Design a protein around this ligand. Structure first.
Ligand SMILES: [Zn+2]
Lengths: 52, 136, 216, 189
RNA sequence: GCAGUCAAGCGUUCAUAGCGACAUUGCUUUUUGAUUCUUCGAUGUCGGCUCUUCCUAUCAUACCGAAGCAGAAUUCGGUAAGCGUUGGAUUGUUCACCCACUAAUAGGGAACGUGAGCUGGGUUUAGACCGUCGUGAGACAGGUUAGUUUUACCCUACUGAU
């Protein structure tokens, strides 16, 4: 069984995220700066590549 | 290390290090088995690695049947002459060091084994147990 | 061997160009100092932006070439070749020399040390002072959002801090915009090839009627 | 720079009592009693009325004024969990291996355990935080509804099951198995 | 040698999962220089064996993130030097190079660690041979052989002992 609404729920915490380009840290999808002090809150972000 | 061994063997006193020579037991035309290293063989400086009864060694043939000479093959040692302790108390040792050629997966290359075979080796590899005349 | 650009950055020695005393000099890495709409009038592009410097140091020849490439592979892709007049202002005229001592360099087993340290030329340089235009770009006024970005991409190809200043002059001329309005209202200013010719109130009178048919 | 006056207003609902002395906020009401301690903030409360509390600050910077509206929201979450309450609906997602969640009362308290998570043989213990009752939705076979009168001890316990039911050494976009939260509602609604 | 920066282009789609040309800013002192400040009433000059400790620029192991991460497999990145990082053939070798094991066979310091600790194979005295050079004596960061390794009982340090 699938329950395809639940796959939309599971993507909220794993697939609907953003990754920083410098420190590879997982970030909110509505990010604007990284929440770390190692990259330096850089404004060079990227979306998370999904499946297939 | 000993890939293809069935279970576990205990600590048997390391009697034959590298450079040793075992009289080959099987009838596959080899006679000597010059040990070049052992599967296992932890690392400590200037300690040359030693084999015990039942280990899989890597050996080269030094005498007989030139099809098998001059290259590396794995070998299973089936008799050692260093007196090791069985956990039921008795100490025992055979009268020659002896080894049986095999592949990595434990398939012994020969057809039968002359002389006795130690229980600690015959219990570990099944195909040295289905070819052994005497299990000690 | 390409010695780094921090080795020949500052202005330590006095100018040393190619001359009759400097016969053996290799050429620069720049050969074209003007691309874009080179054959454009002064009238079509009324906006000029400057890429000026903030410090006194030397600009390498291949550095200016690589930045000339980077500014020109931006505006030709986001605005096309028609709508910019790029003009590299500074020329590489200095000659940088190098003291080679490689393990087979002109001589025997060991070449020498600091005895006879005069070095053969290897590269060119372009001396730029505090406030000197490097990349003048002429284009239209409403296309100015590209050349702010396009010369921002050229800033990262040579050292120093370099300001991106717009100029109130009518493009590549030396006078302001409201002067050029009155000089386009009145016919005082006559179009040359890619430049323009101004009124000379001083001169022979008949040459000011042989020229300027629209004035009077 | 330093703002000369910054106030917020906490609307106190009906039947709800609030007790504050030296930045300790004790809230009692129709269901439950919450006591949160706020000594780490320079904040002045004042009883301007019996229905609404003014909360203010004086000569605070951008750091300090930002930490004023987080105080009004922390009291507002206290009285909201005291009038209505808080409930968190969580949901089981699994590809093949079924997750089997129970509730066991060991030597200390109501541990929550999960078993057969992705075929695993290790139980995954997670205690309840007190004040939080644990509830299963009987009608839907793959659902769990946490509930309690504080939003903190519910949501920390709701995130506890999300942290403990994670995957290891596999693609998380393929192996999307776990126990996630979907609904953060109130009790009387 | 180690990295940072901007991004034309590679990746059949896709400037950045991974790379990245043209250029540019740095760091390191384990290379090689360049210099001549210290040592010419001498600081025992290669390498190996033995042994301790330190560094992180992480090969392994621990816990994490990332992808053209389905699993396996593999790559990239973070905290991290706690702990391990081998047995051999040839060469005087450092270096190199194969064989084999292994979780792994990471890189470096400490007067290019360490000779009143060793060894003396190498080089760097005198014997001798060959090759080329020289008319000759002789020369050769060219080849090959044979060539004495001294003292601690003092102060400190350390290890134990009153
Ligand atoms: Zn970041």
């Amino acid at each position: 069984i699938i329950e395809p609404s639940l796959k939309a729920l599971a993507s909220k915490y794993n697939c609907d995220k953003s990754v920083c380009r410098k420190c590879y840290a997982r970030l909110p999808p509505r990010a604007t700066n990284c929440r770390k002090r190692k990259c330096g809150h850089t404004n060079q972000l990227r979306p998370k590549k999904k499946l297939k | 290390s000993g890939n293809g061994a069935q279970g576990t063997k205990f600590r048997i006193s390391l009697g034959l290090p590298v450079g040793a020579i075992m009289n080959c037991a099987d009838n596959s035309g080899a006679r000597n088995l010059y040990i070049i290293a052992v599967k296992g063989s932890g690392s400590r400086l200037n300690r040359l690695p030693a084999a015990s009864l039942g280990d899989m060694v890597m050996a080269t043939v030094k005498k007989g049947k030139p099809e098998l000479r001059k290259k590396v093959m794995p070998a299973i040692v089936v008799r050692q002459a260093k007196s090791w302790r069985r956990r039921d108390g008795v100490f025992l040792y055979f009268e020659d060091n002896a080894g049986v050629i095999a592949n990595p997966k434990g398939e012994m290359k020969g057809s039968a084994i002359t002389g006795p075979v130690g229980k600690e080796c015959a219990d570990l590899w099944p195909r040295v147990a289905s070819n052994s005349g005497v299990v000690v | 061997a390409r010695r780094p650009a921090r080795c020949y950055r500052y202005q330590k020695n006095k100018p040393y160009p190619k001359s009759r005393y400097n016969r053996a000099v290799p050429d620069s890495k720049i050969r074209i100092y003007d691309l874009g709409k080179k054959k454009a009038t002064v009238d079509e592009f009324p906006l000029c932006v400057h890429l000026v410097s903030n410090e006194l140091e030397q600009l390498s020849s291949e550095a200016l070439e690589a930045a000339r490439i980077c500014a020109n592979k931006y505006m030709t892709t986001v605005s096309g070749r028609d709508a910019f007049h790029l003009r590299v202002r500074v020329h590489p005229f200095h000659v940088l020399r190098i003291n080679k001592m490689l393990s087979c360099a002109g001589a025997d087993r060991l070449q020498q040390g600091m005895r006879g340290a005069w070095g053969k030329p290897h590269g060119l340089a372009a001396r730029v002072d505090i406030g000197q235009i490097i990349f003048s770009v002429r284009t239209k006024d409403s296309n100015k959002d590209v050349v702010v970005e396009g010369l921002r991409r050229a800033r990262y190809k040579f050292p120093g801090q370099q300001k991106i200043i717009l100029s109130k002059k009518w493009g590549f001329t030396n006078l302001d915009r409201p002067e050029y309005l009155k000089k386009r209202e009145a016919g005082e200013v006559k179009d040359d090839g890619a430049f323009v010719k101004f009124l000379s109130k001083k001169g022979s009178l008949e040459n000011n009627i042989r020229e300027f048919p629209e004035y009077f | 720079m330093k703002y000369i006056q910054t106030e917020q207003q906490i609307e106190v609902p009906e039947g709800v009592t609030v007790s504050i002395k030296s930045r300790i906020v004790k809230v009692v009401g129709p269901r439950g009693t919450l006591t949160k301690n706020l000594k780490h903030i320079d904040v002045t409360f004042t009883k301007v009325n019996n229905q609404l509390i003014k909360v203010a600050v004086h000569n605070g910077g951008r750091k300090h004024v930002a930490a004023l509206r987080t105080v009004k929201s922390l009291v507002d979450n206290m009285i909201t969990g005291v009038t209505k309450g808080y409930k968190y609906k969580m949901r089981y997602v699994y590809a093949h291996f079924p997750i089997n969640v129970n509730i066991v009362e060991k030597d200390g308290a109501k541990f929550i355990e999960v078993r057969n998570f992705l075929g695993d043989k290790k139980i995954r213990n997670v205690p309840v935080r007190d004040g939080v009752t644990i509830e299963f939705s009987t009608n839907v076979k793959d659902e769990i509804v946490l509930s309690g009168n504080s939003v903190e001890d519910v949501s920390q316990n709701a995130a506890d099951l999300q942290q403990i039911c994670r995957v290891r050494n596999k693609d998380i976009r393929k192996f999307l198995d776990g126990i996630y939260v979907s609904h953060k509602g109130f009790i009387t609604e």
